[PDB]
Scaffold this motif. Structure first.
Motif, PDB file in Angstrom:
ATOM      1  N   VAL A 112      24.749  88.044 -13.176  1.00 23.50           N
ATOM      2  CA  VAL A 112      25.200  87.971 -14.560  1.00 23.50           C
ATOM      3  C   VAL A 112      24.922  86.182 -14.712  1.00 23.50           C
ATOM      4  N   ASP A 113      24.590  86.552 -16.458  1.00 21.30           N
ATOM      5  CA  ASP A 113      24.822  84.621 -17.033  1.00 21.30           C
ATOM      6  C   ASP A 113      25.045  85.459 -17.693  1.00 21.30           C
ATOM      7  N   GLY A 114      25.983  84.355 -19.116  1.00 19.99           N
ATOM      8  CA  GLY A 114      25.864  84.982 -20.139  1.00 19.99           C
ATOM      9  C   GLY A 114      24.807  84.170 -21.514  1.00 19.99           C
ATOM     10  N   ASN A 153      10.762  65.119 -18.170  1.00 19.11           N
ATOM     11  CA  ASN A 153       9.713  63.923 -18.953  1.00 19.11           C
ATOM     12  C   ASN A 153       8.293  63.945 -18.793  1.00 19.11           C
ATOM     13  N   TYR A 154       7.746  65.522 -19.779  1.00 16.95           N
ATOM     14  CA  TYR A 154       5.764  65.654 -19.956  1.00 16.95           C
ATOM     15  C   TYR A 154       5.204  64.409 -20.244  1.00 16.95           C
ATOM     16  N   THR A 155       5.809  63.557 -21.440  1.00 10.74           N
ATOM     17  CA  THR A 155       5.105  62.253 -21.753  1.00 10.74           C
ATOM     18  C   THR A 155       4.715  61.822 -20.120  1.00 10.74           C
ATOM     19  N   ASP A 210      28.214  73.860 -21.690  1.00 12.65           N
ATOM     20  CA  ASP A 210      27.066  73.031 -22.439  1.00 12.65           C
ATOM     21  C   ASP A 210      26.572  73.255 -23.237  1.00 12.65           C
ATOM     22  N   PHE A 211      25.534  72.908 -23.250  1.00 16.97           N
ATOM     23  CA  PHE A 211      25.507  73.218 -24.484  1.00 16.97           C
ATOM     24  C   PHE A 211      24.875  74.234 -25.354  1.00 16.97           C
ATOM     25  N   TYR A 212      23.119  74.745 -24.222  1.00 15.02           N
ATOM     26  CA  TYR A 212      22.899  76.063 -24.216  1.00 15.02           C
ATOM     27  C   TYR A 212      23.778  77.025 -23.915  1.00 15.02           C
ATOM     28  N   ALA A 214      14.030  64.970 -22.975  1.00 19.77           N
ATOM     29  CA  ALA A 214      13.078  65.231 -23.471  1.00 19.77           C
ATOM     30  C   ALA A 214      13.249  66.136 -24.127  1.00 19.77           C
ATOM     31  N   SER A 215      13.925  66.930 -24.269  1.00 22.80           N
ATOM     32  CA  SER A 215      14.718  67.525 -25.317  1.00 22.80           C
ATOM     33  C   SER A 215      15.609  67.626 -26.349  1.00 22.80           C
ATOM     34  N   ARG A 216      15.437  66.069 -27.068  1.00 24.24           N
ATOM     35  CA  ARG A 216      16.213  66.643 -28.251  1.00 24.24           C
ATOM     36  C   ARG A 216      16.507  67.495 -29.350  1.00 24.24           C
TER      37      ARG A 216
END
Ligand SMILES: Cn1cnc(S(=O)(=O)N(CCN(Cc2cncn2C)c2ccc(C#N)cc2)CC2CCN(C(=O)OC(C)(C)C)CC2)c1
Ligand SMILES: CC(C)=CCC/C(C)=C/CC/C(C)=C/COP(=O)(O)OP(=O)(O)O
Ligand SMILES: [Zn+2]
Lengths: 407, 323
Positions: free
Chosen positions: A280-282, B76-78, A343-345, A82-84
């Motif tokens: 700490v966190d990158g 999934n908020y939907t 991860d991509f974040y 849900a975050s593409r």
């Protein structure tokens, strides 16, 4: 001198920066001590292996990782279904920082995908057929601006977008994240970011918004998610950055804020924590350190004469050292901290933070600091939008050609 | 009914009672980007979710389906929105749904959507009677959970449940006096009840803080709280403070105590104190000690303070260029 260690984290004085727990143990100190021990091994590994340290940004490995992700991901990313648009943005921005061009057929395919994510009534959703939401809306716009072609710009439906923003606006100055959803400072930033880039800001769109944000600054100096909450790097970045866009930085106490963020840099690790007495966190290399260029620009507009002319008000050297030594995965991609997985974040925000720490600039003055080999140098990033300074200028100019919807 | 992790779980395309519905495949286009290789279970649940969403089918069976869609991806908020439509439209028992959400939060407590759902439920029912105890349980596993403290603040404020919170704060400060979330809750409670203008209250708060600083001189939270509650009226308004801090230098020093000293001098020079110059140089000395020795990570900050103070408080600062 020959006896001198050029790396700040490896100097012998550095050992004095370890945690002093006053012989009173609590959950907080136990956890902080575990991390420091793990980071000390990373620092000491060169000495124990009898090799001379070399800080190399693994450009090749990171490129392969990104190039692939931009097309296809394993089921480990089901939690991001849900975050593409965020994935589009994180990846495209990482490539941009690494100076890797975007094949024009990739650009077209991204455009078309984001079109499928766009709501008939304005804004973008997390995927095709999902309802609109301000966070993926912010990511979508940023990605199209990174691409920066006429095709990209033309994807965004500006009339609808403004309608969408209005339907989220609250009487007290805040915005909902989405219809039937939650209010917090992130949403003001998301809204101010897409509205300013696409030139849709009406006289009353942001009535009360600066004031509402200012209520989120607390007794600590930093900014919380909503009025009353603990100060946090993510919300503080969003709050200040939104004020800068609206030209209302002065609504804040900039001094107590500056004292707060500078305290968020860890004396031993060199990286940033997100809030007082946590780890700490990158990724905070961007949300936290990204505040210093913003404060610099703000204080300078107030005529502040005490400002440095070559450095941000944080330890640039030590941040670079943390990221390069502790936040890289050998196979490619970046991470939160040693022992965590890539991860991509974190790839996006660790690199964004590295760039901040490499590049200082205040109008006429310009000064770089690049730790390790010179090829480490990255493309610079805009501190308000976290896309390329050029991509910002190009986009704003293009949309200034259109009139604000409703004339 | 049929849990998503049950050994006897069956895909939706193999369930008889779903035979009438055509599933609806995701439309990713002719050449996808950031395309996720979903597992079988996942793709099967969401193909059927899209079908019911598309037809706006408001049935018992769609309601049960949203439970699985959420469990596969609680972000999934939907799906969450559709679920709330079915709660109202099917007239579902909302206490049963509270039982449900309390379990989901227990297992995935760092998700935005699950906390917002709980809030809507409390709003609908107008019943906060389960909340403080539920939140205490979550905080007992992670005493710093951001969503948890936020929900706690909302509940207390909306329903005016202030009477036991200070007592709760004192309990958690006992367990971990380094917990910045708890020091924040302390300020939140006092701000909204007595306030900090009551001299007796402010007095109490400072003694307690100084007391904790003595027990744990290097705990930054305590230091920030003390500064926080004195800095609005102005540090220089409290003249006993300075000497009492210097009297800890010997056996309770830290870069935190040094930094506070600088802040006191800074305010003093702003409210035009005696010995203007004696105070300045004391401060420039400390700024230097911090930048060179005691707190070098902040060298760029402390050099900035040093320059600032010079720029506006040196004896030459008001003297015209011609003199
Ligand atoms: C410690 N922390 C730092 N940022 C956050 S966040 O802001 O909560 N969220 C990141 C969640 N987060 C966890 C995390 C990141 N750093 C340490 N941790 C444990 C992520 C998020 C994405 C990835 C990836 N890839 C990896 C980790 C970033 C996203 C999550 C939700 N989001 C969003 O738009 O998605 C929805 C609209 C579907 C909610 C935008 C912000 C937490
Ligand atoms: C525009 C946009 C969406 C910006 C993102 C803003 C951002 C990074 C917010 C942080 C929110 C949060 C709950 C952090 C705490 O997580 P944690 O307790 O796991 O992390 P921590 O211990 O480091 O505080
Ligand atoms: Zn992170």
């Amino acid at each position: 001198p020959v006896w001198s260690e050029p790396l700040y984290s490896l100097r012998p004085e550095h050992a004095r920066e370890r945690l002093q727990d006053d012989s009173v143990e609590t959950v907080t100190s136990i956890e902080q001590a575990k991390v420091e021990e793990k980071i000390q091994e990373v620092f000491s590994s060169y000495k124990f292996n009898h090799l001379v340290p070399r800080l190399v940004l693994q450009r090749e490995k990171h490129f392969h990782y990104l190039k692939r992700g931009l097309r296809q991901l394993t089921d480990a990313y089901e939690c991001l279904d849900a975050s593409r648009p965020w994935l589009c943005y994180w990846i495209l921005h990482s490539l941009e920082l690494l100076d890797e061009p975007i094949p024009q057929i990739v650009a077209t395919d991204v455009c078309q995908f984001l079109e499928l994510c766009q709501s008939p009534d304005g804004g973008f959703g997390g995927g095709p057929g999902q309802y609109p939401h301000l966070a993926p809306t912010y990511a979508a716009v940023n990605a199209l601006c990174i691409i920066g072609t006429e095709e990209a710009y033309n994807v965004i439906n500006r009339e609808k977008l403004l309608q969408y923003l209005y339907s989220l606006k609250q009487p007290d100055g805040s915005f909902l994240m989405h219809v039937g959803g939650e209010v917090d400072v992130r949403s003001a930033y998301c809204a101010a970011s897409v509205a300013s880039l696409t030139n849709i800001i009406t006289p009353d769109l942001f009535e009360g918004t600066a004031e509402w944000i200012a209520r989120c600054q607390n007794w600590e100096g930093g900014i919380g998610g909503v009025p009353g909450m603990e100060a946090h790097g993510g919300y503080t970045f969003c709050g200040l950055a939104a004020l800068v866009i609206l030209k209302k930085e002065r609504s804040l106490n900039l001094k107590s804020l500056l004292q707060w963020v500078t305290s968020r840099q860890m004396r031993f690790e060199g990286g940033f924590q997100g809030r007082c007495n946590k780890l700490v966190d990158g990724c905070y290399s961007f949300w936290q350190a990204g505040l210093l260029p913003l404060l610099h620009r703000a204080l300078h507009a107030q005529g502040d004469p005490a400002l440095s002319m070559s450095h941000w008000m944080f330890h640039q050297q030590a941040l670079q050292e943390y990221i390069l030594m502790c936040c890289q995965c050998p196979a490619g991609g970046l991470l939160d901290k040693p022992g965590k997985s890539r991860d991509f974040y974190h790839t996006c925000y660790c690199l964004s933070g590295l760039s901040i720490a490499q590049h200082f600039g205040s109008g006429a003055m310009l000064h770089d600091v690049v730790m390790g080999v010179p090829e480490n140098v990255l493309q610079p990033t805009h501190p308000v939008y976290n896309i390329g300074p050029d991509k910002v200028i190009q986009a704003t100019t293009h949309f200034l050609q259109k009139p604000v919807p409703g004339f | 009914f049929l849990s998503l992790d049950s050994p006897t779980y069956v895909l939706y395309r193999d369930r008889a009672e779903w035979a009438d519905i055509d599933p609806v495949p995701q439309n990713d286009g002719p050449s996808p980007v950031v395309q996720i290789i979903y597992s079988e279970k996942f793709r099967d649940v969401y193909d059927y979710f899209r079908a019911v969403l598309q037809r706006d089918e408001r049935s018992e069976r769609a309601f049960k389906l949203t439970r699985d869609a959420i469990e596969l991806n609680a972000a999934n908020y939907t799906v969450w929105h559709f679920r709330r439509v079915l709660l109202r439209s099917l007239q579902k028992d909302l206490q049963e749904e509270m039982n449900y959400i309390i379990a989901i939060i227990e297992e995935q407590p760092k998700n935005y959507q699950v906390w917002h759902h709980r809030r809507v439920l409390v709003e609908w029912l107008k019943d906060p009677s389960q909340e403080l105890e539920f939140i205490a349980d979550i905080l007992n596993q992670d005493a710093k959970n951001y969503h948890a403290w936020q929900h706690r603040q909302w509940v207390i404020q909306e329903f005016r449940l202030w009477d036991n919170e200070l007592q709760y704060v004192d309990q958690l400060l006992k367990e971990d006096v380094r917990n910045n979330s708890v020091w924040n809750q302390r300020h939140f409670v006092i701000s909204n009840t007595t306030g900090y203008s009551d001299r007796a209250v402010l007095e109490r708060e400072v003694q307690y803080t100084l007391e904790m600083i003595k027990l744990v001189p290097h705990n930054e939270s305590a230091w920030n709280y003390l500064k926080g509650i004195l800095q609005d009226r102005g540090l220089s308004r409290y003249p006993n403070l300075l000497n009492q801090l210097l009297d800890l230098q010997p056996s309770h020093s830290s870069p935190y105590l040094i930094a506070f000293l600088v802040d006191i001098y800074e305010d003093m020079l702003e409210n035009q104190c005696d010995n203007k110059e004696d105070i300045l140089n004391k401060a420039l000395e400390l700024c230097e000690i911090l930048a060179k020795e005691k707190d070098t990570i902040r060298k760029e900050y402390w050099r900035y303070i040093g320059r600032s103070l010079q720029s506006k408080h040196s004896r030459e600062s008001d003297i015209p260029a011609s003199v």
